[PDB]
Amino acid sequence: MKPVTLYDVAEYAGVSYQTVSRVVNQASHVSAKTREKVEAAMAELNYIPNR
DNA sequence: AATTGTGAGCG
DNA sequence: CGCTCACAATT
Ligand code: NA
């Protein structure tokens, strides 16, 4: 399956791969609508942890 | 001060 | 190349 990285969800959502990382781990500085976009994205793309 | 991006450092 | 961790320079 399509190896959906953080970079991929991040690009689609409207955020940097760092921020989508700090949704998962080192979680900090993912603000209201940007985090809503990642919560959207997590479903709209089927993210693969580590690849 | 608030986050991104740079860097750094492990995977 | 993939992800986490903390930090400062831009803003
Ligand atoms: Na992860």
Side-chain angles (χ1 to χ4, degrees):
Chain A
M1 292 282 176
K2 178 170 214 293
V4 185
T5 51
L6 293 170
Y7 296 92
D8 286 304
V9 266
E11 286 164 57
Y12 188 80
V15 268
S16 80
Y17 106 88
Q18 213 45 257
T19 310
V20 167
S21 177
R22 296 204 188 104
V23 160
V24 163
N25 271 303
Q26 214 239 281
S28 188
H29 294 300
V30 73
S31 259
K33 189 161 183 174
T34 56
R35 195 181 64 240
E36 275 210 68
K37 295 287 179 184
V38 195
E39 289 186 283
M42 286 319 148
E44 261 80 53
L45 311 177
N46 56 93
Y47 180 57
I48 307 171
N50 292 105
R51 277 301 298 170

XYZ file of all heavy atoms in Angstrom:
844
model
N 0.835 -1.218 0.000
C 0.000 0.000 0.000
C 0.872 1.272 0.000
O 1.960 1.327 0.567
C -0.918 0.022 1.232
C -1.991 -1.058 1.174
S -3.386 -0.624 0.072
C -4.332 -2.131 0.176
N 0.282 2.284 -0.621
C 0.779 3.668 -0.757
C 1.449 4.102 0.566
O 0.754 4.198 1.585
C -0.380 4.606 -1.121
C 0.063 6.065 -1.230
C -0.998 6.982 -1.832
C -0.358 8.094 -2.678
N 0.451 9.084 -1.940
N 2.777 4.249 0.572
C 3.505 4.499 1.822
C 3.427 5.978 2.205
O 4.276 6.789 1.853
C 4.901 3.922 1.579
C 5.115 4.006 0.072
C 3.713 3.983 -0.542
N 2.328 6.260 2.893
C 1.945 7.617 3.334
C 2.761 7.967 4.590
O 2.382 7.604 5.702
C 0.433 7.700 3.655
C 0.015 9.143 3.995
C -0.453 7.196 2.516
N 3.745 8.821 4.342
C 4.617 9.414 5.386
C 3.894 10.542 6.124
O 2.946 11.120 5.598
C 5.912 10.038 4.824
O 5.701 10.951 3.736
C 6.989 8.991 4.536
N 4.470 10.985 7.245
C 4.071 12.278 7.851
C 4.039 13.439 6.845
O 3.051 14.177 6.811
C 4.990 12.696 8.997
C 4.884 11.765 10.218
C 6.019 12.127 11.174
C 3.530 11.823 10.922
N 5.050 13.502 5.973
C 5.189 14.615 4.996
C 3.939 14.804 4.127
O 3.372 15.897 4.129
C 6.399 14.470 4.064
C 7.774 14.518 4.748
C 8.335 13.287 5.143
C 8.573 15.682 4.609
C 9.716 13.190 5.359
C 9.968 15.593 4.820
C 10.519 14.341 5.178
O 11.873 14.216 5.268
N 3.351 13.662 3.772
C 2.143 13.477 2.946
C 0.852 13.987 3.594
O 0.067 14.671 2.938
C 1.974 11.991 2.696
C 2.979 11.458 1.677
O 3.003 12.006 0.559
O 3.627 10.437 1.968
N 0.611 13.534 4.824
C -0.529 14.063 5.608
C -0.374 15.558 5.888
O -1.242 16.341 5.527
C -0.858 13.281 6.905
C -1.934 12.241 6.623
C 0.351 12.668 7.620
N 0.860 15.933 6.204
C 1.218 17.324 6.523
C 0.938 18.290 5.340
O 0.150 19.238 5.482
C 2.688 17.414 6.934
N 1.458 17.916 4.174
C 1.228 18.623 2.885
C -0.247 18.855 2.527
O -0.670 20.012 2.419
C 1.920 17.909 1.717
C 3.442 18.106 1.709
C 4.154 17.092 0.807
O 3.818 17.032 -0.396
O 5.112 16.464 1.307
N -1.032 17.777 2.640
C -2.484 17.735 2.427
C -3.280 18.539 3.476
O -4.293 19.155 3.158
C -2.834 16.243 2.556
C -4.276 15.889 2.188
C -4.591 15.761 0.824
C -5.245 15.728 3.203
C -5.908 15.479 0.447
C -6.563 15.445 2.826
C -6.880 15.308 1.460
O -8.077 14.777 1.122
N -2.833 18.449 4.720
C -3.531 19.098 5.856
C -3.346 20.616 5.886
O -4.338 21.335 5.943
C -3.099 18.501 7.192
N -2.127 21.082 5.616
C -1.759 22.511 5.702
C -0.726 22.828 6.803
O -0.605 23.972 7.265
N 0.118 21.843 7.046
C 1.132 21.819 8.125
C 2.468 21.188 7.671
O 2.564 20.481 6.669
C 0.683 21.205 9.455
C 0.143 22.314 10.364
C -0.343 20.086 9.362
N 3.488 21.493 8.463
C 4.841 20.956 8.287
C 4.944 19.564 8.935
O 4.274 19.292 9.941
C 5.837 21.947 8.907
O 5.946 21.836 10.330
N 5.763 18.705 8.344
C 5.970 17.318 8.823
C 6.350 17.248 10.312
O 6.012 16.282 10.997
C 6.992 16.642 7.893
C 8.415 16.423 8.416
C 8.618 15.223 9.118
C 9.468 17.359 8.230
C 9.877 14.960 9.676
C 10.737 17.093 8.790
C 10.911 15.895 9.526
O 11.993 15.676 10.324
N 7.013 18.293 10.810
C 7.350 18.464 12.237
C 6.133 18.447 13.186
O 6.190 17.908 14.296
C 8.081 19.798 12.344
C 9.155 19.827 13.436
C 10.046 18.590 13.448
O 9.872 17.722 14.284
N 11.094 18.529 12.653
N 5.181 19.275 12.788
C 3.905 19.602 13.467
C 3.004 18.355 13.494
O 2.604 17.902 14.557
C 3.276 20.770 12.679
O 4.239 21.811 12.484
C 2.039 21.394 13.315
N 2.877 17.695 12.346
C 2.202 16.381 12.215
C 2.924 15.260 13.002
O 2.269 14.443 13.644
C 1.946 16.181 10.711
C 1.540 14.798 10.224
C 0.783 17.093 10.373
N 4.242 15.370 13.094
C 5.057 14.604 14.081
C 4.686 14.901 15.537
O 4.296 13.980 16.235
C 6.560 14.810 13.870
O 7.302 14.125 14.880
N 4.673 16.175 15.929
C 4.212 16.657 17.252
C 2.680 16.698 17.499
O 2.161 17.446 18.321
C 4.873 18.019 17.427
C 6.394 17.915 17.481
C 6.841 19.150 18.241
N 8.300 19.269 18.194
C 8.977 20.129 17.418
N 8.337 20.975 16.604
N 10.307 20.111 17.496
N 1.955 16.036 16.610
C 0.602 15.495 16.876
C 0.679 14.105 17.550
O -0.004 13.810 18.528
C -0.136 15.518 15.516
C -1.351 14.588 15.410
C -0.560 16.945 15.205
N 1.649 13.337 17.063
C 1.925 11.946 17.465
C 2.914 11.908 18.640
O 2.560 11.526 19.756
C 2.407 11.285 16.155
C 3.135 9.964 16.331
C 1.240 11.145 15.159
N 4.134 12.398 18.405
C 5.248 12.401 19.368
C 5.980 13.744 19.434
O 6.095 14.480 18.450
C 6.218 11.276 18.999
C 5.816 9.977 19.683
O 5.701 9.873 20.901
N 5.735 8.894 18.937
N 6.398 14.051 20.662
C 6.854 15.364 21.153
C 5.727 16.412 21.021
O 5.971 17.620 20.919
C 8.173 15.819 20.500
C 8.979 16.608 21.522
C 9.282 18.039 21.060
O 10.177 18.281 20.266
N 8.458 19.015 21.363
N 4.504 15.960 21.282
C 3.285 16.740 21.036
C 3.198 18.086 21.742
O 3.168 18.200 22.971
C 2.062 15.860 21.300
N 3.243 19.095 20.882
C 3.301 20.517 21.240
C 3.218 21.329 19.943
O 3.799 20.970 18.920
C 4.646 20.804 21.897
O 4.629 22.131 22.400
N 2.550 22.464 20.038
C 2.425 23.484 18.978
C 1.773 22.988 17.672
O 2.350 22.983 16.592
C 3.766 24.201 18.753
C 4.153 25.008 19.990
N 3.446 26.003 20.536
C 5.119 24.667 20.825
C 3.996 26.258 21.719
N 5.014 25.425 21.904
N 0.547 22.519 17.867
C -0.388 22.156 16.787
C -1.775 22.689 17.120
O -2.579 22.137 17.884
C -0.273 20.647 16.441
C -0.879 19.695 17.484
C -0.916 20.472 15.067
N -2.005 23.805 16.452
C -3.002 24.788 16.867
C -4.358 24.416 16.269
O -4.458 23.459 15.514
C -2.543 26.178 16.419
O -1.985 26.827 17.554
N -5.386 25.139 16.650
C -6.786 24.695 16.490
C -7.175 24.158 15.102
O -7.575 22.990 14.990
C -7.770 25.781 16.912
N -7.142 25.011 14.091
C -7.563 24.615 12.735
C -6.526 23.708 12.059
O -6.881 22.709 11.461
C -7.900 25.859 11.921
C -8.550 25.554 10.569
C -9.268 26.802 10.072
C -10.004 26.525 8.763
N -10.796 27.687 8.371
N -5.244 23.934 12.356
C -4.141 23.131 11.796
C -4.191 21.670 12.290
O -4.117 20.745 11.482
C -2.774 23.764 12.068
O -2.564 23.982 13.458
C -2.619 25.066 11.277
N -4.440 21.506 13.579
C -4.765 20.230 14.245
C -6.093 19.617 13.777
O -6.096 18.454 13.386
C -4.721 20.450 15.759
C -4.684 19.157 16.581
C -4.661 19.462 18.080
N -5.893 20.129 18.514
C -6.013 21.333 19.088
N -5.000 22.176 19.285
N -7.220 21.720 19.448
N -7.138 20.438 13.594
C -8.368 19.971 12.911
C -8.097 19.426 11.509
O -8.579 18.345 11.169
C -9.470 21.016 12.806
C -10.326 21.052 14.077
C -11.743 21.488 13.732
O -12.437 20.698 13.042
O -12.095 22.631 14.079
N -7.198 20.074 10.762
C -6.743 19.605 9.439
C -6.013 18.254 9.508
O -6.110 17.490 8.552
C -5.800 20.630 8.808
C -6.399 22.001 8.464
C -7.305 21.883 7.248
C -7.931 23.224 6.882
N -8.840 22.938 5.757
N -5.220 18.015 10.561
C -4.494 16.741 10.775
C -5.460 15.602 11.176
O -5.344 14.499 10.636
C -3.346 16.855 11.815
C -2.419 15.644 11.704
C -2.478 18.094 11.579
N -6.467 15.961 11.971
C -7.582 15.072 12.367
C -8.467 14.687 11.172
O -8.859 13.531 11.043
C -8.450 15.698 13.456
C -7.721 15.734 14.802
C -8.619 16.217 15.946
O -8.863 17.432 16.060
O -8.940 15.378 16.809
N -8.624 15.635 10.239
C -9.208 15.410 8.915
C -8.342 14.426 8.100
O -8.736 13.285 7.859
C -9.317 16.800 8.286
N -7.134 14.878 7.762
C -6.060 14.125 7.065
C -5.845 12.671 7.495
O -5.823 11.807 6.629
C -4.725 14.869 7.167
N -5.605 12.421 8.786
C -5.564 11.045 9.348
C -6.627 10.083 8.787
O -6.354 8.891 8.673
C -5.623 11.102 10.874
C -4.278 11.572 11.431
S -2.813 10.858 10.592
C -1.685 12.218 10.756
N -7.788 10.624 8.430
C -8.862 9.872 7.759
C -8.828 9.976 6.217
O -8.747 8.960 5.524
C -10.231 10.271 8.339
N -8.770 11.204 5.703
C -8.631 11.480 4.255
C -7.440 10.865 3.493
O -7.556 10.630 2.292
C -8.735 12.981 3.987
C -10.166 13.307 3.528
C -11.185 13.413 4.661
O -10.931 14.185 5.608
O -12.291 12.847 4.499
N -6.319 10.690 4.183
C -5.229 9.769 3.791
C -5.073 8.725 4.919
O -5.248 9.011 6.102
C -3.881 10.482 3.578
C -3.916 11.736 2.688
C -2.533 12.387 2.612
C -4.405 11.473 1.260
N -4.741 7.501 4.534
C -4.525 6.417 5.516
C -3.031 6.218 5.842
O -2.280 5.516 5.171
C -5.284 5.125 5.157
C -4.965 4.572 3.777
O -4.097 3.728 3.586
N -5.609 5.116 2.784
N -2.615 7.128 6.715
C -1.252 7.212 7.254
C -0.675 5.892 7.787
O -1.173 5.366 8.783
C -1.281 8.340 8.290
C 0.049 8.611 8.992
C 1.208 8.930 8.258
C 0.107 8.222 10.342
C 2.463 8.785 8.872
C 1.357 8.105 10.980
C 2.516 8.385 10.229
O 3.714 8.431 10.876
N 0.568 5.674 7.334
C 1.418 4.517 7.670
C 2.579 5.011 8.568
O 3.549 5.574 8.057
C 2.006 3.719 6.494
C 0.905 3.288 5.517
C 2.759 2.480 7.043
C 1.483 2.698 4.231
N 2.462 4.771 9.871
C 3.526 5.018 10.865
C 4.859 4.354 10.520
O 4.896 3.154 10.238
C 2.937 4.437 12.142
C 1.453 4.758 12.023
C 1.199 4.431 10.554
N 5.852 5.220 10.298
C 7.264 4.912 9.971
C 7.595 4.810 8.468
O 8.782 4.777 8.131
C 7.922 3.736 10.712
C 8.131 3.984 12.211
O 7.424 3.448 13.056
N 9.146 4.732 12.594
N 6.600 4.677 7.592
C 6.911 4.643 6.146
C 6.055 5.602 5.311
O 6.556 5.955 4.219
C 6.794 3.225 5.563
C 8.028 2.326 5.744
C 9.319 2.877 5.129
N 9.247 3.038 3.671
C 10.193 3.686 2.957
N 11.332 4.068 3.520
N 10.038 3.892 1.651
O 6.058 36.457 27.341
C 5.680 35.184 26.804
C 5.010 35.241 25.435
O 5.874 35.857 24.444
C 4.842 33.813 24.973
O 3.529 33.620 24.421
C 5.964 33.608 24.000
C 5.878 34.961 23.309
N 7.036 35.289 22.439
C 8.283 35.203 22.893
N 9.134 35.834 22.089
C 8.404 36.303 21.074
C 8.690 37.015 19.912
N 9.942 37.166 19.523
N 7.725 37.373 19.049
C 6.458 37.010 19.258
N 6.145 36.299 20.350
C 7.073 35.939 21.276
P 2.897 32.146 24.280
O 1.534 32.271 24.834
O 3.790 31.136 24.908
O 2.923 31.985 22.688
C 1.735 31.904 21.893
C 2.047 31.642 20.415
O 3.252 32.284 19.947
C 2.231 30.168 20.155
O 1.734 29.757 18.871
C 3.718 29.967 20.208
C 4.146 31.232 19.495
N 5.517 31.621 19.849
C 5.993 31.705 21.092
N 7.210 32.255 21.073
C 7.481 32.557 19.809
C 8.559 33.097 19.105
N 9.573 33.613 19.768
N 8.583 33.139 17.760
C 7.565 32.669 17.039
N 6.484 32.168 17.665
C 6.423 32.114 19.019
P 0.739 28.511 18.832
O -0.583 29.078 19.166
O 1.258 27.398 19.671
O 0.730 28.039 17.293
C 1.557 26.962 16.861
C 2.892 27.527 16.416
O 3.801 27.964 17.437
C 3.693 26.517 15.663
O 3.087 26.226 14.377
C 4.971 27.305 15.495
C 4.928 28.323 16.616
N 6.188 28.416 17.401
C 7.284 29.115 16.827
O 7.592 28.967 15.657
N 8.294 29.596 17.652
C 8.253 29.370 19.029
O 8.941 30.134 19.703
C 7.253 28.578 19.604
C 7.345 28.173 21.075
C 6.225 28.111 18.787
P 3.499 24.957 13.496
O 2.362 24.761 12.573
O 3.984 23.828 14.313
O 4.758 25.470 12.669
C 4.647 26.661 11.876
C 5.972 27.166 11.326
O 6.892 27.554 12.364
C 6.699 26.159 10.470
O 7.259 26.899 9.385
C 7.789 25.565 11.313
C 8.094 26.767 12.176
N 8.534 26.317 13.514
C 9.635 26.941 14.101
O 10.470 27.563 13.458
N 9.840 26.855 15.468
C 8.940 26.151 16.281
O 8.847 26.566 17.441
C 7.897 25.422 15.705
C 7.027 24.480 16.534
C 7.706 25.507 14.320
P 7.570 26.216 7.975
O 7.377 27.296 6.977
O 6.717 25.026 7.772
O 9.106 25.763 8.089
C 10.082 26.817 8.055
C 11.323 26.623 8.909
O 10.962 26.157 10.221
C 12.258 25.593 8.304
O 13.411 26.296 7.778
C 12.551 24.626 9.427
C 12.070 25.375 10.677
N 11.635 24.477 11.773
C 10.620 23.632 11.732
N 10.284 23.258 12.979
C 11.104 23.890 13.826
C 11.314 23.893 15.218
O 10.491 23.427 16.011
N 12.401 24.598 15.749
C 13.242 25.288 14.888
N 14.410 25.637 15.319
N 12.999 25.330 13.577
C 11.977 24.651 13.035
P 14.568 25.673 6.860
O 14.827 26.688 5.817
O 14.251 24.296 6.418
O 15.809 25.510 7.865
C 16.231 26.550 8.768
C 16.976 26.001 9.984
O 16.162 25.434 11.026
C 17.953 24.943 9.543
O 19.303 25.386 9.732
C 17.650 23.749 10.393
C 16.953 24.381 11.601
N 16.023 23.456 12.291
C 16.122 23.175 13.677
O 17.151 23.326 14.325
N 15.073 22.476 14.284
C 14.011 22.000 13.509
O 13.106 21.429 14.109
C 13.962 22.180 12.122
C 13.316 21.146 11.213
C 14.938 22.968 11.550
P 20.571 24.619 9.116
O 21.589 25.626 8.711
O 20.133 23.619 8.100
O 21.109 23.791 10.385
C 21.065 24.308 11.740
C 20.781 23.241 12.811
O 19.491 22.606 12.684
C 21.754 22.076 12.813
O 22.475 22.030 14.062
C 20.908 20.835 12.688
C 19.618 21.336 13.324
N 18.410 20.523 13.069
C 17.870 20.264 11.889
N 16.663 19.702 12.045
C 16.434 19.611 13.360
C 15.388 19.135 14.165
O 14.294 18.815 13.695
N 15.526 19.150 15.560
C 16.689 19.655 16.115
N 17.046 19.155 17.257
N 17.657 20.147 15.344
C 17.562 20.129 14.001
P 23.945 21.393 14.132
O 24.772 22.408 14.826
O 24.352 20.956 12.781
O 23.773 20.050 14.986
C 23.393 19.978 16.379
C 22.539 18.746 16.660
O 21.185 18.747 16.114
C 23.187 17.460 16.163
O 23.154 16.377 17.100
C 22.279 17.031 15.049
C 20.943 17.391 15.664
N 19.787 17.233 14.741
C 19.845 17.356 13.417
N 18.712 16.962 12.854
C 17.913 16.585 13.832
C 16.581 16.174 13.913
N 15.929 15.835 12.817
N 16.010 15.927 15.106
C 16.694 16.045 16.242
N 17.962 16.455 16.207
C 18.585 16.744 15.044
P 23.848 16.435 18.544
O 22.979 17.187 19.493
O 25.276 16.792 18.429
O 23.636 14.885 18.889
C 22.331 14.469 19.342
C 21.588 13.529 18.430
O 20.981 14.061 17.248
C 22.503 12.417 17.986
O 21.987 11.195 18.525
C 22.355 12.413 16.506
C 20.903 12.869 16.457
N 20.360 13.116 15.116
C 21.032 13.730 14.157
N 20.251 13.903 13.098
C 19.064 13.398 13.403
C 17.861 13.238 12.697
O 17.711 13.723 11.577
N 16.783 12.573 13.290
C 16.902 12.080 14.589
N 15.898 11.459 15.166
N 18.055 12.262 15.264
C 19.112 12.885 14.701
P 22.833 9.848 18.563
O 23.436 9.804 19.916
O 23.674 9.708 17.346
O 21.631 8.815 18.425
C 20.521 8.891 19.332
C 19.242 8.329 18.717
O 18.943 9.023 17.482
C 19.374 6.868 18.320
O 18.145 6.159 18.689
C 19.718 6.915 16.852
C 18.756 8.008 16.477
N 19.026 8.554 15.122
C 18.005 8.662 14.157
O 16.934 8.066 14.281
N 18.254 9.309 13.008
C 19.463 9.849 12.755
N 19.575 10.307 11.534
C 20.532 9.750 13.661
C 20.289 9.059 14.858
P 18.024 4.546 18.611
O 17.130 4.003 19.656
O 19.377 3.954 18.595
O 17.432 4.327 17.130
C 16.035 4.122 16.847
C 15.801 4.012 15.340
O 16.261 5.167 14.599
C 16.478 2.796 14.724
O 15.685 1.589 14.712
C 16.698 3.247 13.290
C 16.196 4.681 13.252
N 17.047 5.503 12.359
C 18.326 5.783 12.611
N 18.849 6.495 11.606
C 17.884 6.639 10.693
C 17.840 7.209 9.424
O 18.558 8.167 9.121
N 16.697 7.025 8.647
C 15.612 6.340 9.142
N 14.508 6.444 8.457
N 15.629 5.867 10.396
C 16.740 5.988 11.166
O 14.925 8.214 -0.517
C 13.938 8.820 0.339
C 14.116 8.443 1.805
O 15.388 8.709 2.419
C 13.091 9.069 2.769
O 11.984 8.178 2.874
C 13.804 9.137 4.094
C 15.107 8.457 3.812
N 16.172 8.998 4.680
C 16.812 8.168 5.622
O 16.362 7.060 5.892
N 17.701 8.723 6.476
C 17.953 10.046 6.476
N 19.030 10.356 7.159
C 17.282 10.939 5.629
C 16.422 10.384 4.688
P 10.513 8.669 3.273
O 9.650 7.746 2.500
O 10.407 10.137 3.063
O 10.531 8.424 4.851
C 10.313 7.147 5.472
C 10.485 7.297 6.979
O 11.842 7.568 7.407
C 9.588 8.426 7.472
O 8.407 7.914 8.143
C 10.517 9.310 8.279
C 11.699 8.393 8.569
N 12.978 9.124 8.758
C 13.549 9.963 7.888
N 14.698 10.422 8.381
C 14.882 9.874 9.595
C 15.877 9.920 10.575
O 16.729 10.801 10.630
N 15.756 9.100 11.702
C 14.653 8.282 11.860
N 14.269 7.844 13.024
N 13.694 8.278 10.928
C 13.782 9.041 9.815
P 7.246 8.814 8.827
O 6.009 8.022 9.047
O 7.094 10.126 8.175
O 7.875 9.171 10.264
C 8.210 8.179 11.248
C 9.131 8.717 12.328
O 10.446 9.137 11.889
C 8.499 9.859 13.071
O 8.094 9.419 14.374
C 9.548 10.959 13.021
C 10.840 10.171 12.815
N 11.961 10.937 12.237
C 13.146 11.151 12.966
O 13.233 10.872 14.161
N 14.090 11.979 12.454
C 13.880 12.647 11.311
N 14.859 13.381 10.837
C 12.729 12.474 10.544
C 11.765 11.589 11.002
P 7.314 10.374 15.396
O 6.378 9.495 16.133
O 6.726 11.484 14.622
O 8.531 10.897 16.281
C 9.288 9.984 17.096
C 10.461 10.643 17.810
O 11.301 11.357 16.890
C 10.075 11.663 18.862
O 10.712 11.201 20.073
C 10.468 13.004 18.338
C 11.707 12.556 17.581
N 12.087 13.442 16.468
C 13.427 13.748 16.176
O 14.345 13.557 16.977
N 13.716 14.422 14.989
C 12.699 14.769 14.100
O 13.016 15.536 13.184
C 11.364 14.466 14.373
C 10.226 14.800 13.419
C 11.069 13.820 15.583
P 10.152 11.545 21.527
O 10.501 10.394 22.389
O 8.717 11.906 21.448
O 11.025 12.847 21.876
C 12.432 12.740 22.150
C 13.186 14.033 21.830
O 13.197 14.346 20.436
C 12.656 15.266 22.549
O 13.354 15.438 23.812
C 13.014 16.378 21.608
C 13.671 15.702 20.415
N 13.233 16.335 19.166
C 14.176 16.958 18.322
O 15.177 17.492 18.776
N 13.774 17.379 17.116
C 12.485 17.277 16.750
N 12.262 17.709 15.530
C 11.480 16.766 17.561
C 11.871 16.236 18.792
P 12.870 16.415 24.998
O 13.609 15.966 26.207
O 11.396 16.439 25.050
O 13.426 17.862 24.595
C 14.847 18.039 24.724
C 15.461 19.153 23.903
O 14.994 19.115 22.543
C 14.991 20.498 24.424
O 16.164 21.318 24.650
C 13.978 20.982 23.441
C 14.730 20.496 22.216
N 13.916 20.606 21.003
C 12.773 19.959 20.872
N 12.432 19.834 19.585
C 13.336 20.539 18.910
C 13.395 21.042 17.607
N 12.857 20.404 16.593
N 14.256 22.009 17.259
C 15.151 22.472 18.134
N 15.156 21.993 19.384
C 14.277 21.048 19.803
P 16.081 22.834 25.162
O 17.229 23.044 26.058
O 14.720 23.158 25.681
O 16.310 23.621 23.787
C 17.523 23.517 23.008
C 17.578 24.477 21.820
O 16.499 24.310 20.874
C 17.462 25.865 22.378
O 18.490 26.711 21.859
C 16.007 26.233 22.148
C 15.783 25.573 20.797
N 14.386 25.186 20.468
C 13.918 25.322 19.142
O 14.541 25.949 18.288
N 12.754 24.744 18.775
C 12.008 24.070 19.674
N 10.930 23.505 19.175
C 12.386 23.905 21.014
C 13.600 24.484 21.405
P 18.922 28.026 22.667
O 20.375 27.926 22.944
O 17.982 28.227 23.793
O 18.684 29.179 21.595
C 19.334 29.046 20.319
C 18.487 29.599 19.180
O 17.194 28.986 19.202
C 18.273 31.082 19.392
O 18.550 31.869 18.196
C 16.822 31.171 19.792
C 16.310 30.078 18.869
N 14.971 29.543 19.181
C 14.576 29.337 20.426
N 13.376 28.756 20.466
C 13.003 28.606 19.188
C 11.956 27.922 18.556
N 10.931 27.418 19.216
N 11.950 27.736 17.223
C 12.950 28.205 16.468
N 13.954 28.875 17.025
C 14.021 29.084 18.365
P 20.028 32.190 17.640
O 20.766 30.940 17.339
O 20.654 33.190 18.539
O 19.810 33.005 16.276
C 19.278 32.331 15.124
C 17.829 32.711 14.835
O 16.749 32.335 15.718
C 17.697 34.197 14.578
O 17.867 34.401 13.169
C 16.354 34.563 15.129
C 15.673 33.205 15.303
N 14.660 33.258 16.378
C 14.903 33.659 17.615
N 13.952 33.222 18.451
C 13.100 32.511 17.720
C 11.956 31.735 17.936
N 11.450 31.490 19.125
N 11.300 31.109 16.935
C 11.727 31.243 15.678
N 12.819 31.962 15.409
C 13.519 32.579 16.390
P 17.761 35.825 12.431
O 18.660 35.722 11.256
O 18.002 36.915 13.407
O 16.232 35.919 11.945
C 15.664 34.900 11.101
C 14.160 34.696 11.165
O 13.705 34.372 12.492
C 13.369 35.915 10.707
O 12.616 35.652 9.501
C 12.455 36.240 11.867
C 12.384 34.909 12.572
N 12.025 35.046 14.009
C 10.864 34.449 14.548
O 10.296 33.548 13.949
N 10.583 34.609 15.915
C 11.477 35.285 16.746
O 11.414 34.978 17.940
C 12.604 35.912 16.213
C 13.457 36.909 17.005
C 12.882 35.782 14.860
P 11.868 36.855 8.718
O 11.660 36.472 7.295
O 12.630 38.101 8.936
O 10.506 37.090 9.549
C 9.391 36.171 9.596
C 8.473 36.390 10.803
O 9.208 36.343 12.035
C 7.725 37.716 10.872
O 6.436 37.726 10.241
C 7.422 37.880 12.349
C 8.257 36.785 13.003
N 8.977 37.332 14.177
C 8.454 37.125 15.461
O 7.981 36.029 15.758
N 8.940 37.887 16.519
C 10.029 38.747 16.342
O 10.725 38.879 17.348
C 10.561 38.959 15.072
C 11.632 40.015 14.803
C 10.041 38.242 14.000
Na 5.045 8.006 14.603
